[PDB]
Design a protein around this ligand. Structure first.
Ligand SMILES: O=C(Cc1ccccc1)Nc1nnc(O[C@H]2CCN(c3nnc(NC(=O)Cc4ccccc4)s3)C2)s1
Ligand SMILES: O=C(Cc1ccccc1)Nc1nnc(O[C@H]2CCN(c3nnc(NC(=O)Cc4ccccc4)s3)C2)s1
Lengths: 410, 410, 410, 410
């Protein structure tokens, strides 16, 4: 027997003749994109053999094999419906329905406390799925860059725990939701910020990453770390957003001075520089598609699903997912934990970094915020998503009433 | 072929006649109990068979068919290792190790505020397991009866949501933690108790169950419900605890009057009778074994794993697990959710009702409480349990490092 | 080929038919006693056939088989020189030499402390050995009865740990050595007596054994336990010593009231009654011979060597030996632990209960005590024993210089 | 009859002539390392035989014998499973389990004390095993140098007892534990430090070693002596530790002048110089691996296991193990002797020199210390080790219950 032949005869019409477009169409049907990095050798070989002629354009058993052999394990998985969502084409059809149902929710207000945020049309709206196996789907304005803003707080927290461990990091920042009556003050009883997802805790977390090197290096390191997380999809930087976040961060300066007086930073911290580094991190740019891969790294235990690279240690990913469960949607965190039951993080640009652990990462993005600061359409989509599929964290994987389970072929 | 025979040949192992004990030893090694209520036809037929046969004891292929025919579906899954934890033998060896390790942890003080709690030895330590498939294991003092106390709050909240639905119930009780917060206060900002797991929330929830009947029926209605969740294993009642709980419940009356003044109950509530009913529900008795079956019903989407009976709606089990996650362990809830990441509930008698969704339910019991009111040995065992197994809510099911996964066999 | 004949050929070799006396001389040369309770059925069958037959007195292979059939495993090990000391004859020859050496050491003062057993002769000196296999040897006054006194302290501690557990028992008593130290104090810094071998620790351990019954029952319970350790050899009682210990224990009454005031006993303790139970346990009587079997039981992981019966749990025997190591010999414990490195316990009647783990148990008895309260001859013998043999806890089993190893063969 | 072909017919599947790598894989599975000094002749010969890389590589029986003849006795013992842990592959699998189980106790605090230990990461964690026969295993950061600090106290005590005898050495230092917050006192009743494992006694012991020569020779001579102990594996020296230790030993200078005034040193001692020698000895560097060999020399009666050389007299080793038993772990000595039962010595760098007499030596190393000054992870590992294996000094070798005995076959 032979692994590449057995797959060949499957894609074949039971015949000696596989058009190349047919193989590409059959591959996309699994949800993988031809640009998938773990498929490069195969796609390289297809480019080679499609240069060989122009009156081709078709693969023998051994020429087909000549392309796929380097990537055969991944390709057989895709075609033998081994992926976490076997019938992904039906799943994207539901994601499209949900997208159009949230698209009709044109409420909310675009953040206008800085020009870069207020310029954004209230009509932009995108949703991008990337499963733990790299299957990709997008509806809407998914390639438009926007700033992460607070959506960066879990990513940097995970960096910090990845490099330093849980015990050190939580010498400086708590582990618990603050919660709603006291969503205003800065420090819990132990004089630490309540958790990494509030501004004070985010600011403290910023002060732990790559201590010793300067802010130009530190930002470089976070970018490289973020690139690993997105499988080298789009990550960028809005200097405009940086400058206006910087020129109007009085509450952030208040927090930094308060944390300094309270001795909240590690020894040898330059607080005013950390605020600058914090403003930079908030201005990092992503798209729906590329942020969805970062979310899929978190859904996948710290392995980037479209490169296979270990990016975050599993301690880091669990801690971060834990804190996004209870602290990730501002004052809506408890409501969201209760009704959506998914680790998520929103940001003022309108992003919601959403994680279905073991299944998929998602990024939703619609600039109009509700009065708690969360994207209206993003919040609506998250609710529908879990009304549809047994993705709620305490849904039962066996008895789940009439919710749909996309992990099953039935 | 035929379901009874191919399993018969599975156990026949070369001989034709299967010895009875040999079938029973293979059956128990799956972790099922011969007294499992879903095995009754099979076991009555065995017992009857060993009456009507010489001294046997051996089963022919047709006699084996006669016994196991009624229960053949479950017996196959048990024997084809298709249960949620396939190598249950090895798993219980680990439970035993965890049990022994927490047994060395003294510290804590038995709740002594009432003499019925003060009587229990500090050396009582019991732990019981029941998987979503009915597989069972127990170590230590697991047949000693003790009162649920606060472990009843998630159970009665589940009853309320099952009968009334999420929306009606949470008109009266919020859905968000305290955190470590302050929980001396009674009402959130909507003049609702914060969540069903704090005493004020519990008291209100109690005021919703079976409105209209008297306390004697209300009580029977809840016990009938508990009986089902426990597959009809021990659910008792400690009138000595009840009388002593009501003759020293100043804070609870303080709460009942405050709630009445703030109009937190449904119209037509007799508040002082609701407090009496509340005190009854706290004095309901369980063993580790029987309460572990209650936990498994919540692990199993509302179906009792040892009877197959549906006890709670999926919406009921989901909300309860969400709230045990964030508000179940008193002021340790945030730490517990962070480090253990399992829906759990503690009680002043020393129990920790614990739920590993889709896997198993547990009850750990050791009377000595720590400063926050949680069983010292149970909190310890819970930490070790998740140190060992990738059971943490935000562990990854694929990439989990050196953690052991008992749903795998590799 | 049968074990009975194979063994039969061993002692036959030459003539056929083994004379009974030839069998008996070869049996006792292994160091077993013909009265060994594990050989009773063999010995009854001999005695019977030497009635059944005016013949012989000679055993052919089939008659020898009839006799030794039921005790063949032990008789095999005994004759195949598989006992822990194979050349037992040579070893006892060394015991005798050590015995005669300690005998010329005629110093010390018999405890005048007590009108009774200030009555024993300084010239009484006895030494009894029982190995972990039942091999016995005695030299000197080894059938003279004397009181355990403090030699009972490890035995009742072992009983308490056995019934109650290490963890319950050591809520009431520490585990750390005396030392020259706080020789006079009663309590360590946790307000517990320092360990079970000091009088206040012993008095507390006594208050733990068989709580809830009267002193007559407790005493029978401890004596039945002492009977099993001693393979049912002499365990008696000296009311003469007891009554006299009881009307002259002002120090112990001092300890009992201090312990009561500092809340060291279990709830519901009758301290003055405990003091009388304690006085009773000190007046329990043994011989060297019978007490050597108790030591051997501790040397054998808790199995009585001459009955094969489990008397104490492994946890109980290990704790006891750990505490006899460091607290066993009054203010000589540190010195003794250093120079002898054997778990031992001395009593004021002149006994020293010596345990060579995995080898043998011993009792040495000479009434004259040195200024520290340890038998002058016994301490001398214990020093000579360890200079001769590589029995010191921290001798090496493979590299031991000019020391003799009696587990090895000649 | 032969002996080297016997081994050849064992290593060979009774066929051709044994690939060299197959012999190497067979050897490494006994636990021996190919770098074993006692195997140098055999490995020189394989290195010589395989120098015809022109063509190899099989051992034409006589060619096999050509290599193994010199070291046959040690090679057959290894292959005939005569080593003290026969199934050494299984044992190291348990060591890894124990290692990773301890790896999760991230509690404790690295000695800030001096910058050179404040520079070591709380993530480091290594554990090395060397049995009395040379079988080696390591897990974790076992090649990272760290200072012995007080782990050197038993090694220099043994040297002094080796060179000067027990009577002389204990004219100056005692032989008994002090005994729990007893530790402040520098001197016992006879105005000698209490034992060689406290700083006062260690300082006095240091002043006995190689009197007459200057401190540069003395340090050299202790290095040569430590080189033999480690089988010439890594022994080094940290000058940075040394200078930091000397610029901050006010306590040691306090002890120094106390001993000088109390006339505790040998005549003609230069106390201030001895302090400097002492500081050097504490700054001597080892690795986990090389330290485990030092520990295995003490487990092996003073013979280095991987060289066969007699390094310490048996008097020195037994005295050293006796004093490590009772005095080795600071205020935790008594608790440690009781619950672990192994002679051990800890150091502020985070090391624990662990000895299982007649079985193996070990070094565990993790910088973070508990409040008693003992490595958190190391203490956790020691507890687990004795909870698994019957290595407790007073575990019975025959009746040992739940525990694995690695000295035994199947
Ligand atoms: O002592 C000398 C001379 C001397 C010798 C050496 C050192 C100093 C003085 N002459 C006396 N000897 N005994 C005397 O009366 C003793 C009898 C028992 N008793 C106590 N036992 N345990 C105690 N400690 C605690 O209950 C908690 C605790 C323990 C340790 C530290 C703090 C609290 S008190 C008082 S008078
Ligand atoms: O107590 C506290 C309170 C405290 C402080 C911090 C934390 C907790 C508690 N602090 C002190 N600790 N040590 C102090 O002085 C040191 C130096 C002198 N001294 C001695 N060492 N050896 C001696 N010899 C005998 O003792 C013989 C001898 C023994 C028996 C009988 C006669 C003579 S003297 C100890 S001061």
């Amino acid at each position: 027997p032979s692994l590449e032949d057995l797959l060949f005869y499957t894609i074949a019409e039971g015949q000696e003749k596989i058009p190349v477009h047919k193989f590409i169409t059959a591959l996309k049907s699994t949800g993988l994109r031809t640009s998938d990095p773990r498929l490069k050798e195969c796609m390289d070989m297809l480019r080679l053999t499609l240069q060989t002629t122009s009156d081709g354009v078709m693969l023998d058993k051994d020429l087909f094999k000549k392309c796929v052999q380097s990537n055969i394990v991944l390709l057989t998985q895709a075609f033998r419906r081994k992926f976490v969502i076997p019938d992904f084409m039906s799943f994207t059809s539901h994601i499209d329905e949900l997208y159009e149902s949230a698209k009709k929710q044109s409420g909310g207000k675009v953040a206008d406390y800085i020009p870069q945020l207020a310029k954004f049309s209230p009509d932009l709206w995108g949703v991008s799925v990337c499963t733990v196996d790299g299957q990709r789907h997008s509806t809407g304005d998914t390639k438009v860059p926007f700033c992460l803003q607070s959506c960066v707080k879990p990513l940097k927290y995970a960096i910090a725990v990845n490099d330093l461990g849980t015990e050190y990091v939580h010498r400086y920042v708590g582990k618990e939701p603050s919660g709603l009556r006291f969503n205003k003050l800065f420090l819990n009883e132990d004089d630490k910020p309540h958790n990494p997802m509030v501004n004070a805790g985010a600011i403290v977390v910023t002060s732990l990453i790559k201590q010793g090197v300067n802010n130009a290096e530190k930002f470089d390191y976070v970018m490289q770390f973020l690139n690993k997380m997105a499988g080298n999809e789009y990550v960028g930087f809005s200097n405009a957003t940086f400058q206006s976040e910087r020129e109007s961060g009085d509450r952030n300066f208040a927090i930094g001075y308060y944390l300094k007086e309270k001795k909240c930073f590690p020894e040898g911290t330059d607080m005013v520089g950390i605020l600058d580094f914090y403003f930079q991190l908030c201005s990092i740019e992503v798209t729906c598609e590329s942020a969805s891969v970062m979310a899929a790294t978190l859904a996948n235990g710290g392995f980037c699903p479209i490169t296979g690279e270990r990016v975050l240690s599993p301690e880091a990913v669990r801690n971060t997912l834990s804190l996004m469960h209870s602290c990730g949607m501002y004052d809506f965190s408890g409501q969201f934990a209760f009704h959506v039951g998914l680790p998520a993080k929103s940001g003022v640009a309108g992003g919601i970094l959403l994680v279905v652990p073991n299944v998929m990462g998602m990024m939703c993005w619609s600039p109009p915020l509700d009065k708690m600061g969360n994207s209206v359409k993003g919040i609506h989509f998250c609710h529908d998503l879990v009304s549809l599929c047994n993705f709620h964290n305490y849904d039962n994987l066996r008895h789940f009433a009439k919710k749909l389970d996309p992990r099953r072929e039935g």
